Amino acid sequence: DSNNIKYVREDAKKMHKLWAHIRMAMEGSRAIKDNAKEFVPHPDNTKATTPEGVARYKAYIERAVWYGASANTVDGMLGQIFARDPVFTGPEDKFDMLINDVDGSGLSIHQQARDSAEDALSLGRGGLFVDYSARPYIKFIAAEDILNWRERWVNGAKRTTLLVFREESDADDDGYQIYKEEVWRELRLVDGTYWQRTWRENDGQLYVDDWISPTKADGSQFDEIPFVIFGSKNNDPTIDMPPMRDLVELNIAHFRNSADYEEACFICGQPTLFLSGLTEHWVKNVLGGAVVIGSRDAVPLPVNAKPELLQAEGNGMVKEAMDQKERQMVALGAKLIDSDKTQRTFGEASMEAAAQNSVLSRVSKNVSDAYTKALRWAAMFLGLDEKIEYELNSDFDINKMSPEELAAVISAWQSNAISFTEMRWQIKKGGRAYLEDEDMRNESEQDDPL
């Protein structure tokens, strides 16, 4: 109550820490080192209280190495899902405005879908908002910017009644605004009618705009809020666990083991003479506090003296732990590294292909469904056809089609089992065509050169 617009749901607040961890793993190594106190425990906190202790801790962290497997994993997932371009079903010239500048920024719909897929793969949450200005726009809401939602059953129907998200912008002014201007959008559903208003702050004040009920091209307002929360699991507001939690914690464990290993390498990695059976009389007499060790110089020692070059040997247990964690990272199925030494047999991998591509297929289907819903709502704004679809590239492991594959596709087209558009989509999918189907049609209807 009391109009607490900036409120955040408790479950989302609980998940915010893990979201920050995943985002910081996405950041790189500087974010991890700048926040290393919460990842790598101090070898002894008694020193950490002291200033020489914090200096030692900073030296310990700074020498460490961030392997950064999670970011490469996410890049690989986005490259696999977003190969070629998502196919659009239905009239195009009427929807060209949405395809070209999806939110009026000039950013194409494909790039926004790519960002949505990346955010639904890394931390498994996002949002697509459709607002009417004339032109409708499709927004992308970051997973951290959804603040509140509700699920009240009306006549036993799962409905999203309340929905508050944070909109970020720099106000177009004259003076240099070092501050960020924060805009809160409130979306509500009352008796099957969609209402929205905007909260804006200034000088600590809060402004509330009048309720406005946007209407379709014909009218009739709405019965549902035009907002979808896409995620890895399903397109529901309920929190979906991020797919990258285990890989990120594996990276953290490998990072701390790497810190320990780098400390060992810095300290005991160099050979040391370690003269034994030596008396200071001999040292001050002949050694003179200096040893010349090159092959051009030979140093004498007294009776019962044994020089012992001592340095830590390889294949240690910290190295074994680091390599074990790298192997586990690979095992979890992330497209994280390419191991040139290890070999894989063709054909056998075609059985586990469906297993590895599980998260990829789930995210592709979820993002395609969310974009279909958004485009249907935009059509409702514009009064266009509803039976249109936006399907991501659901066929993974893309590669060039061999001559045999191309001949098979063509022969399938000769029979009345593949549509000409489907043939063109397959040919482009194999990287053998770039011109549009209608363009080549018009170019080839003319008589052959001969």
Partner 1 sequence: QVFNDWAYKTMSEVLDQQVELFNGATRGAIILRSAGNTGDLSEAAFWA
Partner 2 sequence: KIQGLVRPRDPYSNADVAAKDLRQLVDNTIKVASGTPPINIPPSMLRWIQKNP
CB of 54 to partner 2, least distance (A): 12
Of the two residues 220 and 238, which places its CB atom closer to its own copies in the complex? Answer: 238
How far is it, in rounded angstroms, from Cα 412 to Cα 278? 88
Q: Is the dihedral of CA 407, 409, 410, 414 positive or negative?
A: positive
Residue 447 interaction partner, one of partner 1, partner 2, its own copies, none, beta carbon < 5-8 Å per kind:
none
Which region, judged by CB under 8 A, interacts with partner 2, from 1-9, 64-72, 74-82, 348-356? Answer: 1-9
Tokens for 375, please give them.
């485009």
C-alpha angle 116/182/173, rounded to 5°? 110
- Residue 30 Cα distances to 25, 26, 268, 433, angstroms: 10, 11, 27, 43
Taking the complex as a whole, the smallest distance from the CB of residue 11 to partner 1 amounts, in Å, to 8
DSSP letter, residue 286: I
Kindly report the backbone phi and psi dihedral angles of residue 295, in degrees, each rounded to the nearest multiple of 5, phi listed first: -65, -15
Give me the 335-364 binding string for its own copies, x by CB under 8 A, dash otherwise: x-xxxxxxxxxxxxxxxxxxxxxxx-xx--
Interaction between residue 425 and its own copies (CB under 8 A): yes
Give the shortest CB-384-to-its own copies separation in angstroms.
Answer: 18
Count residues binding its own copies (CB under 8 A): 229
Largest CA distance in the chain: 106
- Judge whether 282 and 275 are in contact, CB under 8 Å: no
Is 155 one of the binding residues for partner 2 (CB under 8 A)? no
Paired tokens of 333: 């199925």
d(Cα 221, Cα 205) in Å, to the nearest integer?
Answer: 31
Looking at the Cβ atoms of 5 and 301, the one nearer to partner 2 is 5
Q: Is residue 343 within the footprint of partner 2 (CB under 8 A)? A: no
Answer yes or no whether residue 207 interacts with its own copies by CB under 8 A. no
Q: Measured from the CB of residue 316, what is the shortest distance to its own copies in angstroms? A: 6
- The structure tokens 């109009």 sit at 3
Candidates 2-10, 285-293, 343-351, 427-435 — which segment interacts with partner 2 by CB under 8 A? 2-10
Residue 84: closest CA among 318, 355, 401: 401
- Restricted to residues 20-59, the positions that interact with its own copies (CB under 8 A) are 20, 26-30, 41, 59
Q: Which is nearer to partner 1, 1 or 172 (CB)?
A: 1
By CB under 8 A, residue 2 contacts partner 2: yes
Give the x/- contact pattern for partner 2 in 7-46, rule: CB under 8 A.
Answer: x---------------------------------------
- The whole-angstrom separation of Cα 101 and Cα 114 is 14
Cβ pair 233, 124 in contact under 8 A: yes
Pull the structure tokens for residue 430: 């194999």
| Residue 199 in tokens | 């909260």
How is residue 287 annotated by DSSP? I
Closest distance to partner 2 from the beta carbon of 42 (Å): 15
Question: Given the rule CB under 8 A, which residues bind partner 1?
Answer: 1-2, 11
Confirm or reject binding of residue 4 to partner 2 (CB under 8 A).
yes
Among 193, 284, 407, 438, binds its own copies (CB under 8 A): 407
- Based on the shown chain and the rule CB under 8 A, indicate whether residue 204 belongs to the binding site for partner 2: no
Binds its own copies by CB under 8 A, chosen from 54, 217, 278, 384? 278
- Give residues preceding each break in the chain, C–N over 2.5 A: 133
Type and span of the H or E element at 83: none
Euclidean distance between CA atoms 376 and 137, whole angstroms: 12
Minimum gap (Å) between residue 4 Cβ and partner 2 = 5
**Binding pattern for the stretch 57-96 against its own copies, x by CB under 8 A and - elsewhere:** --x--xx-xxxxx-xx--xxxxxx-xxx--x-x-------
State in angstroms the smallest separation of the CB of 2 from partner 2: 5
Report the run of H or E that residue 345 belongs to, with start and end. none
Please give the residue ranges that form the binding site for partner 2 (CB under 8 A): 1-2, 4, 7
